[model samples]
Target: AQHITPVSEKKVDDKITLYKTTATSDNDKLNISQILTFNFIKDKSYDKDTLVLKAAGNINSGYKKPNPKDYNYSQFYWGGKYNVSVSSESNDAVNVVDYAPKNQNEEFQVQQTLGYSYGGDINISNGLGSKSFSETINYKQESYRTTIDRKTNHKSIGWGVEAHKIMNNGWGPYGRDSYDPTYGNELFLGGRQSSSNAGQNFLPTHQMPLLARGNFNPEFISVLSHKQNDTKKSKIKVTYQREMDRYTNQWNRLHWVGNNYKNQNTVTFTSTYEVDWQNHTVKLIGTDSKETNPGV
Candidate 1:
């Protein structure tokens, strides 16, 4: 028997907007910001799914108050190609990435890069009601060609890449220095890395696994719930249970708790698919079940 999940319905007239942040050219930094408006529509392709719409906007910098002078303004002119795809999907949901290619002349260029980091902590003292600790982590990445711009008559051209990473640490109580009261203090308990096999000479053909954090923002959950309600924007409905797999499963590992605890702790993929828009519905299912030994 096939199980059917029923999703709620809602109608929102809002539109999604993407904003570009100020450029950090002096320090080689570019920050882009985006805001998405929520709208609901019934999609006939998937009677059981919902469809959400997204639109792109111009780029700018200096979000902080009393905007600085160095914050220049520029329009995000679209290149030739603009297409959308469901990067990942399952029986219950889909994650979409919208790609837009802009026209380029010899005067401008763009480059994209991927960065990664790994770190852990060691407990040095667990005596006299005191706990001491130390830890280390570093980030690195390879470059990719996003765009190239040069003056037609000039012998040289400038090239650059744009990249973004979303990260998360699981739900846990906040502590000091090692923790933030508003947001938990624990850094990513596990290590993550991304690379290109063709060497830095060529663009990276693949990316490593990147975990999505659930605790930092409520807006994310709202986005998920919004998708669950509209039939046109999505094809299926599914529920995500938090900390479901994190606690119940256990593997072979040693736990340390003692008075002489000089402590050290530590630790630790993508697919492309063609989607048939005519079919109207796609779903993505995932569970974070991997276990970690905090003190190693």
Candidate 2:
């Protein structure tokens, strides 16, 4: 007698857990904070194929320099912070699918030109001297990356913080890192020594660039870390935080310019997302949001 295993008799021995927590608001500006946790059981299915996950956080649009009616011309200040990290004591061989620490990369990103109905030339630089307000512009972004391999600890960060000058004169991305012109370097996001563009760019292209004139700089933070104590258990955790507003004393210099000057401030709503691997589906487990207005 011969016996064979039937499809109906197959065992679904895999167990995966996904937990998410998110908070958002659009009162005076836009802000979001999210935390995610994923748990996986060690199985032959995962060993044959890599476990992949893509968690990115970005501004739906660049943070803008406050446009006040009082000032003749406001000195342009644009800046922001974007960072991501991974940690695991088990050293489960998780890799940053979107970035490599050993090379330099350049990404050409397109964005809408800035416009202001103010004193200088009517529209902002790239759009110039008042014509069609819908012209597009390209900006070269620059960032710093780091990875740590402690026997029992790990932490990483990307372009911790970046600032730049936007004025009637020529302007490009500037920061304290090597990308700063003062350091004898070119202004490009990622960097410029990559052998190929395979894994150089990461971040959503549809959204606005983080820094530029008439642009706002929102803070972006995301982390991927794992904790596993046994060969049979694997746990990964992710954290995300993003914020943009008219505060931060360093990047903000709102001044009254004209007698007719008045505050022309407004706010709107937005959203964010998450990703994972295994060809399996994950659903929204939980979510939260709030909106508020604060005076400066």
Candidate 3:
């Protein structure tokens, strides 16, 4: 066993202050007031230390009204506005936006045309040589207009359809269900299930033997079944659509059709997927099945 001893520890001194301001709006000018908060902390230790530190400031501006003409149909709309610009000349300073638009629908949109620019530089030296750099970014001019429409006592339903293609590349004959016990015939078609416990509800039509003097005579059986070089190609197409009732705010009636088959052979599969929005969140339901033929 080994023993450890404590060497040194560090202590910190913390201080905080808050300030507020108020102002009136001027003609062709936006009135702004900044609430500044300062926090200072100092750390001291027995040995040499980097003394990690950080400082941050925030400006919370008041709101303003939007021009009515910016919206279609001359509807009465209200918009709050805020413009924030910050500059720092400290090499250790880093600016981070903690909260930003998260979803695809919520994005920054300009309502009025305006121009703005800002720049800054930073240098750091711990009793050594110092270096500095600067940059300037600008927003020239831009504007946007939006519209909203509401209706009552009228019902509207939306319907859509989609189509797709599926392809199958190869094929083989179905497998036998029973096994012969004599002369190791049990191993030919069927035997005790392996320890892997794998099973199939439907016999695979790929990579199975076509035996003689049994359900299938090797001579009459398709030669394409044994030929490893033989290749089969299949094509499948599916179409589906759903409808939503605007009046009840519910979704209904989803239908689809799918087809899968080899060349000159046709198989059909159909299915549907839909959501019933009549309930609180939404209810989803779907079903599908396929049909195939060996000869056709």
Find the candidate with the highest lDDT and give its number.
2
Q: Write the per-residue lDDT of candidate 1 for residues 169-191, one digit (tens) a residue.
A: 33322111233332222222211
TM per candidate comes to 0.19, 0.34, 0.17
Q: lDDT value for candidate 2?
A: 0.27
For 89-169, candidate 3 gives per-residue lDDT tens digits of 112112211111111111113111111111111222211111111111111111111111121101111111111111112
lDDT agreement of model 3 with the native: 0.16
Lowest lDDT block of 10, candidate 2: 255-264
Which runs of model 1 end up more than 4 angstroms from their true locations?
1-6, 11-40, 43-50, 53-87, 90-215, 221-286
Ranking the candidates on TM-score from highest down gives 2, 1, 3
Model 3 residue 121 CA deviation (Å) reads 26
